Point group: D2
Chain length 266, copies 4
């Protein structure tokens, strides 16, 4: 006779958990996460910003890389998120306890973050993480300014209701670099058509493809670097093959159209 199943941990490919040293993207922007999960540190004269933290177990590694960059826990002022799933917002709660950082997010992302990713529209309770509270709610197109760097939120609902692209302008070799940290556009295992928990899912994804295509985008980065053709382990050529935002959006739309057709057939 038969017990209920044990809880199953959210396990991921080893490369998603492989620590890397900070990799410079532009004068003040660094990848400080793992080989296969993005966590961006932007350093200003008035404190640092973190965009995503990856998986829950990455908090100490992130703090190590911040220290290596000259950023103490008191100096981390702000955490921004692409979206509030365990593999991108995992360590936010612990980061808030261990640093000065406050979280800014849209209402959708704040609600999901506050329930630790539980009751996910598509994953249920299978992919949860420690809950965290947002300190500031942001609206579409709202700006947040830290030490003179202006971050603009561009909502791009689909992968989660609260999915957001964050854009800012850094410098490199003396010239401006418009960085676009565009969120995921995948729909892994999702029911796309007639989903009662997300009735306008398709319309939202389509609008989001268009939003991504039009972002100010000298350099695209994505929460999973492979989605934008980054290779964080490739050193001086890590970003050489990166997609434009236009190409990223088009590829995501072609994949989505294929998934729709397969869902209709399945």
């Amino acid at each position: 006779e038969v017990p209920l199943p044990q809880l199953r941990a959210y396990t991921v490919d080893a490369s998603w958990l492989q620590p890397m040293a900070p990799l410079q993207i532009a004068d003040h922007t660094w990848q400080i996460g793992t080989e296969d999960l993005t966590a961006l540190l932007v350093q200003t004269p008035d404190g640092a910003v973190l965009l995503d933290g990856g998986m829950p177990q990455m908090a100490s590694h992130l703090l190590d890389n911040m220290k290596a960059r000259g950023v103490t826990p008191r100096d981390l002022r702000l955490i921004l998120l692409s979206h509030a799933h365990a593999d991108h917002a995992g360590p936010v709660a612990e980061l808030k306890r261990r640093t000065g950082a406050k979280v800014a997010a849209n209402a959708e992302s704040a609600v999901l973050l506050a329930r630790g990713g539980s009751d996910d529209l598509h994953f249920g309770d299978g992919i949860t993480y420690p809950p965290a509270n947002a300190d500031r709610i942001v609206m579409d197109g709202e700006v947040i300014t830290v030490g003179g760097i202006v971050f603009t939120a561009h909502f791009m609902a689909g992968h989660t209701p609260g999915s957001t692209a964050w854009t800012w302008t850094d410098t490199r070799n003396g010239k401006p670099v418009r960085i676009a940290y565009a969120d995921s556009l995948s729909a892994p295992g999702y029911q796309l058509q007639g989903n009662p928990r997300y009735p306008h899912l398709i319309e939202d994804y389509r609008r989001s493809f268009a939003t991504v295509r039009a972002l100010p985008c000298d350099v695209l980065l994505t929460p999973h670097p492979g989605a934008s053709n980054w290779d964080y382990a490739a050193g001086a050529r890590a970003g050489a093959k990166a997609l434009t935002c236009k190409a990223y959006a088009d590829a995501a739309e072609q994949k989505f159209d294929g998934q729709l057709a397969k869902e209709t057939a399945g």
Copy 2:
């Protein structure tokens, strides 16, 4: 020499606080609020639904009218909201403590409700009320079904980010009546253009006018009855002069266009 000002209470016209007896809208739908604030009771064989409660001080009156209708506190199963301002969601926290009711709302409305209307995009802390938690987060177009009555959410952001129209089909004289409880479309004292806390405000209002115009709408009701030309004190002719959703949307858009022009001149 000069102390800081006393706190100022949110005071309203007396008619907004004038109790009225239940007024039947359709076979299972009743206005149970005050003369000038809507609070709709929908009674099903499987419990009752309340859409809005008006001002914070209306909780006991609402429970009295429920009792008059045969609805005990245990029988109130669900509270839905047009939007989470003090004059419409005021008594929600107290209602939850005193009844079996659970709150369903979109993420925007849930976030504002949970802070008691504080840090409002336009009103600051001037119009607050007891905070309440939502039990279920709803997405645009999602349905909720109670005792066979199907409520559909139609987001219509503008007056608040989370503004929602709720629609359902009741019966009257044997025939179906498609009821549309459309939210407010006013922008009282709002900065419309270039608002840093709401950058896409104008676009959102315009989309919301179009949403309202197209709602299934044999009968329109609104949180302030005067917005839809209801007169709750007029008895058997309370709804005789009611606007169509098309006319409500058009009138709101003409007012909004005038406010835009005046803001440009002011």
Copy 3:
């Protein structure tokens, strides 16, 4: 070279996950959990009360047993908790989404429940579960009355800050039965002396031993049945060997004294 560890799921002995049929404790009280985790259903003419739910994956089983007892989801009115760890409050969030149930708990238990057991004073983030909100905060000695059954809270801090014993009087064979659902008194792996996250831990445990010893207690039950010598699989003799509250408290204090001495030596 070496990735960060995978997240580790909270795994438990199979007997803790072994479903059992409802086992009657008294005229209106039933064990409806698993062989080795208590979940008590108290059925009244005015709805049902659940005290604990066990592990997160037990929600559907609990609802099955409620249905077997004549309790539909609408009829579950109240969830009470011994303490807010994953193996006792695990399924609370899901139960709230799927039933009419509202949660009453003390402030300590409410705070831990709302963070899904994360940032535990002793376990860190190793034993988390879906977060849930409390609907009512209870004070020490406060009563809650459902369908004529009066539940009294007795705080007994130690195993968690919010640990609570719940007492009520049922009937059996015509006579009153004072049931005491006393919380855990273990300190598994805890640093007892000089704990910076719990400076008065020892004093609290000692007061809690005394609280437990003095409870009205014709029948003791505990979250882990083995702690009170229940054997839920033993049928008509499941409770034959149960400890008195006095014996439970004394045994827990002797164990605690031994742990203190071993900690001083270790």
Copy 4:
């Protein structure tokens, strides 16, 4: 005929709202509130701590006084509270939005703060303020250390369940000064005996009198300065007449005993 009453604002004596310039208590501790409400700034080489903020409308004044003291918004690291009523925690939410400050509080105070003082055990919804979230939950006797100043929490439940005394050691004229910021011990309009929302109220107050009497206490301060015989407008003699903690506790107990006798007679 008769509308429901207008909401009534929480109004206070003018002196409670009368701004004052910073008044030095010890080398690093300043009163920065109003004439009749305490708000303590402790300045360290590693940022500043605020203990209480007074009424909701005091936020800007507090920030002005911080600026006068050399404390920018980024430099405010921590807010601690005596208890979470509107006249002491009023501006906490706004302070968090406008500074780097994080809130540490016990579970009881955190729960009341998060509901903006609504559903108060004694005041109902009559004395509410903007809700705020705590960033860290503290246990009885726990320490928090900022820039080398060690703050110790001493729970003293009664006026609110979460009432706390905060103690720390500053210096003055070269010598250590043990400062005790003891919470209120009043019970304004409270039902003391047999209160169903607070069954152990009397026992808690009695234990709290004893806690206060034994605090390390070279200098006592209280949320209402008059309770400890401070006169913030008296300049160089503001603290000359201050009570010892022993005298404060004894006076509060004599008042409480009188209130008990009057309640028995009333």
